[PDB]
């Protein structure tokens, strides 16, 4: 009989104390142990991860245990890491098992090498070869010395499609992402290489949306040159002529809803087969069943082919599945953002029956906030229940303390400086604070804003503001004046819909006018306020305190955020002064931009913009000139100078410290100012109406994988500004600045792309319908702002 | 900035068992989240030396 | 309220009219649990009661919820069934 | 702006130097003197003191992720050391310091609760038991307060089923906490919104028989 | 990291007989378009589609046609192999051209399986084409009809193919892009045998010669094996070598590896004779025998003559600063090579 363990003994224990090894032993002093329990004991000591060579054997009456511990890591020095800093290389190793103070398994050294290599395949270092060097030390220690070597990187050199005849190869590679044909510096899309990953599904959707229902991608090869620095990509396809949708038949378990599904799967025979229309029907059923409380509905579609008529009958299989309920909705990883911030962006409720789509949308709303780095979902089955589940969201938060500067350039305003600092999570309540400023040729602005996105639990937002604005009219191509202003504006945002949003709030604004050159139109407003300045002096000052109620409505149904090809954008902003203010007026601005396509591919768009503006006094007073509307420039009507469209200033005979020496001035007494003087200097008006109409065309001189990036558009811009308070009778010798019939028109070409310097927009226009004083600015651009 | 060993926890409201009405009783208290009765008593807060003691 | 966005509000029970017929008086918890299960609300303490609340108030209107209360005995066998088309 | 490298000094000289850095209050240099002392002698006769002193150094220098790691190493290698009760206590303080002082991922206090519990169960007469118990009372209060905040949001939203199930969860795990009594009216109201006056009356009976 | 240009005391003066520019060449794109000598006439081409015919003595234009329409590049990357009054060129748009050696007109054109990167091989009345998607096809020499098609298994990550099949005793011995060299019947395309020569260090990441019943094939990683022509069983194995291409002269084997070092082996067991590591880590093309010496062109555009019995550099000459990508040609006592710009060079 064996083996009575009278005593235990150990040899080779350094870091591991006696108690730590005596713990993990499935056999202990006094037990009766054979060869089956020793083998279990040895394998137990090995599973401790403390040793690399364990040995248990008998003595006379004592069970002796011989061990050799794993080498304790002394330090980890990197050598040759150019692309990656030493600090993150450390953290990635600690999150893998290896770290200083701990121990290394000498059998995992190779896994550390290939493990670090794999990180160099995340980025394009396909020639990387990290070598690990292990060196012993006096005591049981070891200094890991990782030698890095990367000769890189790979620019994928060619993307080729084989089997295409209906469409040219260059046209197909224009829609993705990631391309590599020619990375022209114009062109923004850059050509590096990683997982595609579903760039075939775009090519798949291209043929499928146009009828090719049999379209099958046979094989995709990603080629490498003998030098591991060059990448090719070859995708072999097989197209399938013409296919008309003849009918849709529904099969499988329908959960008793055959009556409404026939509606969702109805078609008008016979029209061309469309993939996204099929995908729509698949999700429409998944959403219908989801409404009837179904967690994971499964809908699949297979096109049965009819070669005789070249038509396709769609076979659809439905499996409603089962019902599940959500016990708890937990949140892991939010050490900063309070629970309410994350939970407020849900659509799957706790307790309520489960919806797979409702869970996925929960992930979408979280990353759209941009508060977190990664958002992972995990629906866990509640222990001891067939249906109850726990939907848990794991998030790694992202620093929302951002410094952001910016520069710009454009004929409309020259160089522009944008500088400020914004915190989108202060201190993690969802609030958005930020001190932001800007600089321009004719305007300097700085603000301090605080915004709560969820003022109510429904989505209504409340935003505070504290601004300061300086305005120089002479640099804005207007009659010389200066309007120093500041104040505070609070406002509410009402999301009535995901397509419509309302705005409302109060605001206090102080306007301290100064350095105003005397002219008729401007001076008329001063009388209505109750002021009587000198018509011979440049020097003047006017402080006005105003309280305003504001209302706004923005409608946006544009399909694409960057280049709209279908949809419309409507914005209406209204202002009115509540009694108690110095001024008594109202202002209403309306902006409209609608896009209408005329083809299958949406590459021929007809954009029509309109912009309306009107304002006037209330109780005898008149609308301030620093609230006037203007037209002409890069944005309003192209072909005219900035704000040159509309009324012109009629200066009074004046003398000023200029210091009247030698050069040009306007109606100066030294230059013989006896009476009122006509000028080219525009002042804008309290009534403006412009309307554009451009024909968006495909760019004609590059037929590569380019044209879908640059947009040409032949336009016909036109508009008018006037003053509904101009006394046309008292100044009969001077033009009627109260007639809205003065419509100024133009026509030209445009160009658009996003460049390394920023988003550009060229516009070579030409005003054929222009009037007196109208200064023409034909070539206009904008590089940033 | 992170928390210093501070007396914020000595402000917490003490534990008191919830009384159950007649014709009624409370949910069964689970094993976890239960504080064993200790009569102590040693120094608490800043009065407790948290420096590591050892001899020899 | 009037015109605001208030996504969709559901609560834990979906009760079709052709699933409340499977429960006849005199059945155990197991049968009721695999017919329509599991009723999320069992209230402390002296009584056993499965509260099934077909709670559909996602839109601005309704406000449409029907509740189904079931009562067993000390040995887990159905004694009383209470269905109500709330609420008016 | 600390200094990294350490001279090759006598054994007692470094430890006597590191001690003075610890007694004064300068933890940043106290670490570096000790961090190199343990990274050169891991199994000396009193190298376990160095491991103990390191844990204390990381905790007072706001280095928590490093403290927990050193704690786990001392437990894994010395689970029966005469001062293992102190290491468990420092472990609890670390997780408690990773918390709020606020419904911000309460698992750090939920893990701290387990660390102090293991301390008072195995070592009732520990020199840190009384203070650990004071912390256990507070940790239990906010772990219930977390559920209250989740119940308060769903109250504003209108998830009554989620509310009563949460308060039920509160009454189960944390029945003797302050947040539990405050969450009781939330359970009653949620019942009245589902037209369960027979249930809300039961809750009302409990609320009336208890003052917070 | 690239070993610099070795200093060679020229045993003789390497000169350029003639130099004719052909199109824009292939550029930095890894193709295989090399000239082909036949009946004192040199046939070369660029990728764009331009195909010419030059005299092997002076390099004058006989005919110069383009294979493009309204231009779009014909994407010629496979070839050129000339036989039976036909010029065979493979393109990357799944096309195989057959030009008459008289005027340069298209005899026939055939749509193949995929990218015809492999140079055409003419055995019997069949033209062997190996595409990029592992499809060894045999096109009829007469009309170009696809007689049969063999599916060679595809790997995960791929190389630039490739394998130009060799033929002996009823069979076309071809290599794969996965690591298996295969042998198939010439008439049916029937599989005879398969042998795997490659080692796998997961997950870390070819023209054969038939000599007296012995098939020599090299692995994509650089493992060398001698195969029995009948069974396909490995005879001897050596773990060094690589792409580009090797050649067998009598009982010696000269080759260039991934590290672009030149070395000689024995036909018996493959033992080492000499090793040249001065052209180390350059970009040498394939080696070819031209009057006793090994000729290799690197990426900078230098040719390197090497003594075959000790590996000593015989000569060195700057030929084209554009560089060399495709393999040289040494037939009819002549020596051809095409730079990356498409310029063809005759030597000495």
Question: Which residues touch D26 (CB under 8 Å, ≥6 apart)?
Answer: none
CA distances in angstroms from B36 to B45, D140, E13, E106, E145, listed in the order given: 20, 13, 99, 96, 89
Residues of C in contact with D199 (CB under 8 A): 43, 51
Interhelix angle D64-77/D47-60, nearest 10 degrees: 150
Tokens of A571: 């914005």
Length of chain D (residues): 212
Q: In 3D, which of A162, A239, A182 has the Cα closest to residue A206?
A: A239
Question: Which residues touch A178 (CB under 8 Å, ≥6 apart)?
Answer: A156, A189, A191, A192, A193, A194, A196, A199
| A256 close to C (CB below 8 A) | yes
Pairing state between β A216-224 and E158-159: parallel
Residues A117 and A13 in one domain: no
Residues A678 and A776 in one domain: yes
User: Tell me, what CATH number does A291's domain have?
Assistant: 3.10.20.310
Q: How far apart are CA D184 and CA D202, in angstroms?
A: 11
Tokens of E318: 């700057």
CA distances in angstroms from A318 to A355, A360, C15, listed in the order given: 17, 21, 21
End-to-end CA distance of chain C: 20
| C63 close to D (CB below 8 A) | no
Q: How far apart are CA A593 and CA A608, in angstroms?
A: 6
Cβ contact E119:E87 at 8 Å: no
Q: How far apart are CA C55 and CA A411, in angstroms?
A: 60
Rounded to the nearest 10 degrees, how much is the dihedral formed by the CA atoms of A9, A12, A14, A20? -40
| Helix/strand/coil percentages in chain C, nearest 5 | 10, 30, 60
Tokens of D105: 């991922």
Provide the chain A residues 140-199 that lie in CB contact (below 8 A) with chain E: 151, 157-158, 160, 162-163
User: Chain E residue closest to A158 (CA)?
Assistant: E29
State whether D129 and B40 contact (CB < 8 Å): yes
Interface size between A and C, measured as CB pairs under 8 A: 54
Q: Which of the listed residues A152, A186, A202 is the one where a domain comes to its end? A: A152
What strand order describes the sheet that includes E293-297? E288-290, E293-297, E302-307, E313-318
Distance to chain D for B29, nearest Cα, Å:
5
Burial of B31 (0-12, 13-18, 19+ CB in 10 A): exposed
State whether C10 and A498 contact (CB < 8 Å): no
Burial A95-133 (b: 16+ CB within 10 A, else e): eeebbbbebbeeeeeeebbebbbeebeebbbbebebeee
Distance to chain A for C25, nearest Cα, Å:
24
Find which of C42, C45, C46 to mutate to test the B interface (most B CBs within 10 Å of its CB).
Answer: C45
H or E stretch including D71? helix D64-77
Provide the chain D residues 72-111 that lie in CB contact (below 8 A) with chain A: 73, 76-81, 98, 102-105, 107-108
Tokens of E106: 């298209």
| A582 close to E (CB below 8 A) | no
Residues A656 and A781 in one domain: yes
Q: In 3D, which of D101, D165, D93, D94 has the Cα closest to residue D128?
A: D93
Residue A486 CB-half CA count within 13 A: 5
Q: Which of the listed residues A289, A305, A322 is the one where a domain comes to its end? A: A322
Residues of C in contact with B26 (CB under 8 A): 44-45
Pairing state between β E234-238 and E86-91: unpaired
- How many helices (H) does chain B have, and how many strands (E)? 0, 0
User: Tell me, what CATH number does A707's domain have?
Assistant: 2.40.160.50
State whether C12 and D161 contact (CB < 8 Å): yes
How far, in whole angstroms, is CA A78 from its chain's centroid? 37
How many other C-beta atoms can be found within 10 angstroms of the C-beta atom of residue A329?
23
Rg (C-alpha) for chain E, rounded Å, is 19
Q: Which domains does chain C have, with CATH numbers?
A: 10-88 (3.30.1450.10)
Residues A160 and A177 in one domain: yes
Question: Experimental method used, please?
Answer: X-ray
Residues of A in contact with E243 (CB under 8 A): 226
Distance to chain C for D139, nearest Cα, Å:
26
| E203 close to A (CB below 8 A) | yes
For chain D, the domains span 1-212
Tokens of A398: 């992202």
Question: Which residues touch A262 (CB under 8 Å, ≥6 apart)?
Answer: A250
Residues A45 and A177 in one domain: no
Residues A422 and A500 in one domain: yes
Find which of C43, C70, C71 to mutate to test the D interface (most D CBs within 10 Å of its CB).
Answer: C43
How many other C-beta atoms can be found within 10 angstroms of the C-beta atom of residue E205?
16
Q: How far apart are CA A676 and CA A664, in angstroms?
A: 17
Residues A148 and A162 in one domain: no
Cβ contact A90:A73 at 8 Å: no
Cβ contact A1:A34 at 8 Å: no
Residues of C in contact with D164 (CB under 8 A): 41
Q: How far apart are CA A636 and CA E42, in angstroms?
A: 66
Residue E53 CB-half CA count within 13 A: 19
How many other C-beta atoms can be found within 10 angstroms of the C-beta atom of residue A694?
22
- Say if D and C touch: at least 3 Cβ pairs within 8 Å: yes
Q: How far apart are CA E254 and CA E275, in angstroms?
A: 10
Cβ contact B44:B10 at 8 Å: yes
Cβ contact E176:E184 at 8 Å: no
Tokens of E306: 């090497």
Residues A199 and A57 in one domain: no
Q: In 3D, which of E347, E348, E346 has the Cα closest to residue E41?
A: E346
| Helix/strand/coil percentages in chain E, nearest 5 | 0, 45, 55
Q: How far apart are CA A142 and CA A104, in angstroms?
A: 9
> Between A14, A17, A343, which is nearest D78 by CB?
A17
Query: Which chains touch B (3+ CB pairs under 8 A)?
Result: C, D
Q: How far apart are CA A584 and CA A621, in angstroms?
A: 6
Q: In 3D, which of D177, D166, D169 has the Cα closest to residue D137?
A: D177
Which of helix, strand or coil describes residue A199? coil
Residues A122 and A164 in one domain: no
Beta strands in A254-322 (DSSP E): 271-272, 298-306, 311-319
Ramachandran sector of residue A117 (left: φ over 0; alpha: ψ -120 to 50; beta: rest): alpha
Q: Which of the listed residues A322, A354, A376 is the one where a domain comes to its end? A: A322
**DSSP secondary structure code for residue A631 in this structure:** B
State whether C12 and A385 contact (CB < 8 Å): no
Residues A301 and A196 in one domain: no
State whether C5 and A458 contact (CB < 8 Å): yes
Which range of residues forms the domain containing residue A105? 70-152
State whether A221 and E158 contact (CB < 8 Å): yes
The CATH code for residues D1-212 is: 1.25.40.10
CA distances in angstroms from A617 to A251, A508, A625, listed in the order given: 69, 18, 11
End-to-end CA distance of chain B: 36
| A665 close to C (CB below 8 A) | no
Residues A295 and A345 in one domain: no
CA distances in angstroms from A428 to A401, D100, D101, listed in the order given: 11, 13, 16
Count of domains forming chain A: 6
Tokens of D178: 């302050």
Rg (C-alpha) for chain B, rounded Å, is 18
**DSSP secondary structure code for residue A430 in this structure:** S
Which of helix, strand or coil describes residue D199? helix
Cβ contact C35:C68 at 8 Å: no
Q: Is the peptide bond before C38 cis (omega within 30 degrees of 0)?
A: yes
H or E stretch including D72? helix D64-77
Query: Which chains touch A (3+ CB pairs under 8 A)?
Result: C, D, E
């Amino acid at each position: 009989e064996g083996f009575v363990v009278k005593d235990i003994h150990f040899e080779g224990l350094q870091r591991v104390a006696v108690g730590a090894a005596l713990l993990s032993m499935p056999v202990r002093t006094g037990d009766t142990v054979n060869d089956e329990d020793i083998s279990n004991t040895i394998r137990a000591l090995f599973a401790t991860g403390n040793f690399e060579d364990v040995r248990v054997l008998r003595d006379g009456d004592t069970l002796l245990v011989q061990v050799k511990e794993r080498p304790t890591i002394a330090s980890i020095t990197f050598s040759g890491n150019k692309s990656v800093k030493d600090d993150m290389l450390k953290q990635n190793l600690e999150a893998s098992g290896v770290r200083v103070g701990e121990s290394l398994d000498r059998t995992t050294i190779a896994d550390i090498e290939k493990g670090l290599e794999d990180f160099y395949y995340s980025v394009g270092k396909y020639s990387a070869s990290v070598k690990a060097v292990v060196t012993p030390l006096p005591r049981n220690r070891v200094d890991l010395k990782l030698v890095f070597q990367e000769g890189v990187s790979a620019e994928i050199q060619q993307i080729n499609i084989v089997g295409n005849h209906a469409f040219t190869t260059d046209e197909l590679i224009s829609h993705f992402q990631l391309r590599d044909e020619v990375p022209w510096w114009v062109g923004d899309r850059k050509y590096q290489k990683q997982k595609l990953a579903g760039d075939l599904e775009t090519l798949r959707s291209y043929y499928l949306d146009r009828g090719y229902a049999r379209f099958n991608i046979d094989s995709t090869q990603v080629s490498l040159t003998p030098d591991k620095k060059g990448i090719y990509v070859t995708v072999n396809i097989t197209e399938g002529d013409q296919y008309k949708l003849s009918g849709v038949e529904v099969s499988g378990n329908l959960a008793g809803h055959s009556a409404e599904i026939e509606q969702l799967t109805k078609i008008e025979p016979g029209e061309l087969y469309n993939g996204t229309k099929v995908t729509k029907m698949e999700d429409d059923i998944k959403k219908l069943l989801g409404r009837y409380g179904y967690a994971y509905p499964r809908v699949q579609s297979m096109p049965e082919i009819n070669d005789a008529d070249k038509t396709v009958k769609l076979r659809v299989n439905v499996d409603a599945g089962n019902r599940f309920y959500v016990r708890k909705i937990r949140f892991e990883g939010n050490d900063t953002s309070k629970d309410a911030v994350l939970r407020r962006e849900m659509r799957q409720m706790e307790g309520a029956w489960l919806g797979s789509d409702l869970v996925d949308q929960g992930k979408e709303r979280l990353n759209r906030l941009g508060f977190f780095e990664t958002v992972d979902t995990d629906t866990q089955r509640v222990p001891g229940s067939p249906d109850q589940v726990d939907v848990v969201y794991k998030v790694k938060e992202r620093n929302t303390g951002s410094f952001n500067f910016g520069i710009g350039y454009g004929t409309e305003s020259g160089v522009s400086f944008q500088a400020g600092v914004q915190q989108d999570n202060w201190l993690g309540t969802g609030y958005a604070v930020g001190i932001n400023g800007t600089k321009n040729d004719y305007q300097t602005y700085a603000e301090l804003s605080v915004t709560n996105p969820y003022f109510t639990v429904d989505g209504v937002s409340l935003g505070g503001r504290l601004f300061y604005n300086d305005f120089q009219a002479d640099d804005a191509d207007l009659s010389d004046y200066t309007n120093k202003s500041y104040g505070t504006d609070v406002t509410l945002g009402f999301p009535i819909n995901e397509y419509n949003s309302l705005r409302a709030g109060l605001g206090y604004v102080h306007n301290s006018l100064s350095n105003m050159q005397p002219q008729v139109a401007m001076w008329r407003y001063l009388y209505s306020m109750g002021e009587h300045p000198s018509t011979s002096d440049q020097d003047n000052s006017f402080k006005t305190d105003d309280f305003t109620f504001n209302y706004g409505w923005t409608y946006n149904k544009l399909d694409r955020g960057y280049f709209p090809t279908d949809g419309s954008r409507v914005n209406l902003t209204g202002k009115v002064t509540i009694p108690g203010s110095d001024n008594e007026y109202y202002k209403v601005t309306l902006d409209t931009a609608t896009y209408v396509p005329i083809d299958d591919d949406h590459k021929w768009v007809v954009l029509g913009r309109t912009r309306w503006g009107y304002g006037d006094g209330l109780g005898g007073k008149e609308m301030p000139f620093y609230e006037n509307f203007y037209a002409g420039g890069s944005s309003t009507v192209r072909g005219f100078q900035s704000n040159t469209i509309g009324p012109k200033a009629v200066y009074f005979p004046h003398q000023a410290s200029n210091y009247d020496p030698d050069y040009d001035y306007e109606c100066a007494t030294q230059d013989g100012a006896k009476d009122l003087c006509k000028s080219d200097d525009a002042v804008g008006g309290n009534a403006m109406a412009v309307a554009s109409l451009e024909f968006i065309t495909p760019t004609p001189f590059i037929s590569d994988k380019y044209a879908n990036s640059v947009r040409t558009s032949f336009f016909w811009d036109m508009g008018t500004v006037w003053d509904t308070n101009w006394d046309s009778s008292q100044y009969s010798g001077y033009p009627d600045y109260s007639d809205p019939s003065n419509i100024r028109m133009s026509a030209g070409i445009a160009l658009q792309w996003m460049s390394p310097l920023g988003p550009l927009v060229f516009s070579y226009a030409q005003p054929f319908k222009k009037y007196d004083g109208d200064k023409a600015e034909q070539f206009q651009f904008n590089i940033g702002k | 900035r992170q928390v210093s060993g501070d007396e914020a926890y000595l402000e917490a409201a003490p534990l008191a068992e919830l009384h159950a009405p007649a014709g009624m009783i409370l949910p069964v208290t689970s094993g976890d989240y239960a504080i064993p009765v200790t009569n102590g008593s040693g120094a608490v807060g800043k009065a407790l030396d948290i420096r590591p003691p050892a001899q020899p | 309220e009037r015109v605001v966005y208030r996504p969709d509000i559901n609560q834990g029970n979906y009760l079709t009219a052709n699933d409340v017929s499977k429960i006849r008086v005199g059945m155990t918890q197991q049968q009721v649990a695999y017919a329509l299960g599991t009723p999320l609300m069992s209230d402390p303490f002296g009584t056993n009661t499965w509260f099934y609340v077909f709670r559909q108030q996602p839109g601005h209107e309704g406000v449409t919820q029907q509740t189904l209360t079931l009562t067993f005995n000390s040995s887990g066998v159905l004694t009383n069934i209470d269905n109500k088309p709330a609420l008016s | 702006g600390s200094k990294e490298e350490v001279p090759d000094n006598p054994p007692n000289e470094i430890y006597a130097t590191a001690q003075q850095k610890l007694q004064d209050g300068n933890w940043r240099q106290a670490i570096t003197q000790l961090e190199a002392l343990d990274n050169r002698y891991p199994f000396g006769p009193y190298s376990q003191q160095v491991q103990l002193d390191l844990i204390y150094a990381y905790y007072k220098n706001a280095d928590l992720p490093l403290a927990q790691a050193a704690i786990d190493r001392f437990i894994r290698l010395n689970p029966t050391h005469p001062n293992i009760d102190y290491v468990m206590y420092m472990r609890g303080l670390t997780n408690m310091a990773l918390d709020d002082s606020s419904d911000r991922d309460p698992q750090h206090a939920r893990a701290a609760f387990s660390d102090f519990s293991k301390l008072v169960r195995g070592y009732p007469n520990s020199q840190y038991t009384t203070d650990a118990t004071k912390r256990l009372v507070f940790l239990k209060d906010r772990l219930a307060k977390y559920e209250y905040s989740v119940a308060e949001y769903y109250t504003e939203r209108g998830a009554w089923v989620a509310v009563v199930n949460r308060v039920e969860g509160m009454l189960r795990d944390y029945p003797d906490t302050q947040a539990t009594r405050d969450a009781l009216p939330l359970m009653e109201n949620a019942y009245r919104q589902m037209q369960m006056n027979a249930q809300a009356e039961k809750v009302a009976k409990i609320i009336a028989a208890n003052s917070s | 990291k690239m070993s610099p240009l070795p200093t060679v005391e020229n045993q003789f003066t390497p000169t350029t007989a003639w130099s004719t520019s052909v199109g824009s060449g292939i550029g930095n794109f890894y193709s295989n378009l090399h000239p082909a000598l036949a009946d004192n006439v040199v046939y070369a081409a660029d990728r764009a589609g331009l195909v010419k015919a030059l005299n092997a003595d002076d390099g004058k234009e006989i005919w110069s046609v383009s294979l493009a329409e309204k231009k779009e590049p014909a994407l010629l990357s496979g070839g050129v192999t000339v036989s039976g009054g036909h010029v065979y060129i493979g393109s990357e748009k799944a096309q195989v051209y057959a030009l008459n050696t008289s005027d340069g007109t298209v005899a026939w054109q055939t749509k193949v399986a995929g990218e015809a990167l492999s140079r055409p091989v003419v055995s019997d009345g069949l033209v062997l084409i190996h595409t990029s998607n592992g499809q060894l096809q045999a096109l009829n020499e007469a009309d170009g009809a696809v007689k049969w098609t063999v599916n060679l298994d595809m790997p995960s990550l791929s190389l630039r193919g490739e394998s130009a099949p060799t033929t002996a005793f009823g069979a076309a011995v071809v290599g794969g892009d996965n690591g298996r060299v295969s042998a198939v019947l010439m008439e049916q395309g029937q599989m005879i045998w398969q042998q795997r020569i490659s080692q796998a260090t997961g997950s870390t990441e070819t023209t054969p010669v038939v000599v007296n019943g012995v098939v020599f094939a090299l692995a994509y990683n650089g493992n060398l094996t001698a195969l029995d022509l009948r069974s396909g069983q490995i005879m001897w194995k050596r773990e060094l070598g690589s792409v580009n291409d090797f050649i067998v002269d009598g009982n010696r084997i000269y080759l260039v590896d991934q590290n672009d070092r030149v070395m000689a082996l024995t036909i018996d067991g493959g033992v080492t004779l000499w090793t040249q590591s001065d052209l180390l880590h350059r970009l040498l093309t394939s080696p070819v025998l031209y009057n006793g010496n090994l000729v290799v062109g690197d990426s900078e555009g230098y040719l390197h003559w090497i003594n075959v019995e000790d590996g000593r550099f015989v000569a060195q000459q700057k030929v084209d600063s554009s560089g060399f990508q495709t393999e040289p040609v040494a037939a009819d006592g002549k020596l051809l090579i095409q730079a990356k710009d498409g310029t063809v060079y005759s030597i000495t």
